[PDB]
Amino acid sequence: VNESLKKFLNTKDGRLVASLVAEFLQFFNLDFTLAVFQPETSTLEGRENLARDLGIIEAEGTVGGPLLLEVIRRW
Amino acid sequence: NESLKKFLNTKDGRLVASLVAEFLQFFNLDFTLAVFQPETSTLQGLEGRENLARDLGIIEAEGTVGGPLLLEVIRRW
Known part of the structure; x- marks a missing residue:
């Protein structure tokens, strides 16, 4: 277990x-990466709950990218 | 993976x-990075932390250095 990461x-x-x-990895079907990410991080919030938490209203302009794209687009 | 390539x-x-990638590097998620790079065709590596901070207008300070850059992005979102 990663202590800096655990606290984070x-x-x-x-x-x-x-x-x-994790949602980014899922969005691009980076499944081998996910297979290692899960145990290496000892892990999260799915896309619907995550968009709500981030104040992102899902629509035609958001569904085609990972949620992180909406954040960066509007930065 | 054309979707990722276009992205x-x-x-x-x-x-x-x-x-x-910077988040993975920040937390020494080295095995994850080892798979991430070939899976995304980024074996040469993406842009570095300070390149990204410059792009985002983030100034490194005692309050940013202690977390991955995405932490600062999300604090300020």
Whole structure:
């Protein structure tokens, strides 16, 4: 277990960040990466709950990319 | 994976993916990175943390150095 990561995952913003990374991997079917990510991180919030948490209203313009894209697009 | 290739051929997409890689590097998720790179065809590596911070207008300080760059992005979202 990763202690710096454990503490991070136990923060509000940390959980959101990790959930966004996992959602990115899922979005591009990076399934081998996910197979290692899950045990290496000891792990999160799925896309619907995550979009709500991030104040992102899902629509035609958002469904075609990972949620992190909407954040960066509007940065 | 044409969807990812097209995504990485956009400025915003390359920034997103670079931020994900930086998160993996920040937490020493080295085996995850070892699979991420071939799976995304980014064996040469994406843009570095300070390149990304410059792009995003983030100034490194005691309050940013202690977390991955995505932490600062999400704090400020």
